Amino acid sequence: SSVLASCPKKPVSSYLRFSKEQLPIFKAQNPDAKTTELIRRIAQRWRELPDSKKKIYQDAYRAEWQVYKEEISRFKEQLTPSQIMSLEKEIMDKHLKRKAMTKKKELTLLGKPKRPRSAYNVYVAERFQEAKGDSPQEKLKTVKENWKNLSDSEKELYIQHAKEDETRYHNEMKSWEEQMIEVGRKDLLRRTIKK
Template structure:
């Protein structure tokens, strides 16, 4: 990252002695990026960090989704996202520019606020804060990505035969605790005959075909709205009998 590259000189200087005192808090610093003590200013500095602004399309989609939901209460999110994507494509450039200008303005304000916060920190605090931010980003990355994909209507992944059986049987299990229920369901699955399991195997094959078809349509929508970053690099096409993973 740019910040880390800019701080490389500080790291090199600290590295000569193996460990130094943090200029801002007096805590002992071990390299690379290992801390015995995390100062209290971390929480206040991180809390003041602004959130990255939404892109122009996500801003438009977030604005339109509740409107489309109110007009189509029984429709699935994927169907609504498709309609929103179509509306975005048909939107005149002059109206798209409103969202794009808002994004650029928010992004500029975001950068200025980040710079303002960073200017108040010492070099050692900058290194420490950057490490903390990276750790938090890694923890939240999967959750943020999942929320974004849900908002964009990405199809749910196909379920295995076992997972389909569990979802159907879990609530019927009479055991009190979830762990005991799962154990019972697992034993019931093992005791199923081949012909009984074949029903769930076929349902799983059908679900893989469903996933492939929905993903193909969804990725076409994402390409049309400029979200090529969400497209799979390699797509496996299911054979006619639907026995392969999609």
Template sequence: MAAALLSRVWSSSVSGPRYFLRCSATCSVEKWFSKQSSSDNRPKQPLTAYIRFYKEQQPFYKKQNPDVSVVDITKKIAHAWRELPASDKQPYEAAAKTDRQIYKEQMIKYKAQLTPAQEAALKEEKRRKVEKRRAARKKRQLTMLGKPKRPRSAFNIFMSEHFQEAKGISIQAKMKNLFDEWQKMSSSQKKTYQQLAEDDKIRYENEMKSWEEQMAEIGREDLIRFKNRRKLSKRKKTEKKVASKKRATTLKKPSGSKVASAAAKKTVKARQSEE
């Protein structure tokens, strides 16, 4: 069943032979758990069930489809894992659970031999990792909410235009050569890119203004830049006051029948006074 699933997932967009799961119910724990430690002798974190599955399947996908990108292969394997029956996932999950227990035991021994300074450094590293994950989650959230892209600098615009033809094999080499070329350019040569950068700033501010108004409407004031929070808050209060006044005026304003009745009464009184 698992083999048929993987074959169906892959063949839906990429032609090629079928692939079969290699990890059976006897999947060994030792195969997946690394007994090696990091440079500071700290135990390495064990692989998750999905990463085990990915590392096992990726070579077969890659070998049979060498022209397919890593991103597409990853998507296919991720989809295959989501569709994999619980019974086929069980060997990977069992191995991961066993390795987590071994990792916990090794970490207890590792922490017991640390000096106070080393323990403090370990806590600081953990704090940085947590912050990094939090920042990554926030970035994904902002992308989903459609936050405008930040404006590009003059050099960024220059680099994007000339990156393909830049000298160098690696990305770093290309960037270095472009930076050196940028440094040698005269002020007049840079002026075009600087103007484009100024235009991009205007684009960014206009898009951010509209986006922050949307965030205010859905109650996400926490995503609004601090300098604009007061402005938006003040404007919302003003709009509420105006709307409240309009409602009050509408309620106090007499209806058409009442106006007509009042006019009729005045006419009757006028006639009676004449008589």
């Protein structure tokens, strides 16, 4: 039920067409080399390739562009309003998710401290494994139920471990945010802390 998946995609431009055909060859002749390295060498092949040769690829791309113009129009015109709407949402959702992940992958490279664990988090970590259930979803529900029934005294270790992680997070954030200052990124810093 995804309009987007059935949507005609843009033809590949010249270099990539080349790359798409070259890679399996380089891989055959260099079976153990990392793809990373093969691509670099392939781009070098492309750079050295005489303009008259690239033109061949470009000509193909330009022709492919013409069939794409025709395909995309016919497709769009064939779409009902509700389908147009879901296609737009799908594109929208796809974009935001891509931007989110990109930001997440960054912070992770930058070594941003995980946020604090709650007493509940700590509880799940201690009790998940022995919890009955056919699936993680069911085994989490099991834990959730037993948690709601925990007394305040039964909760003491979980809360204590949570408190301990609060201290952990505080410290780690301190150090990180300072390191981010050195790299001149006070924009990654929190606008508001508490205690």
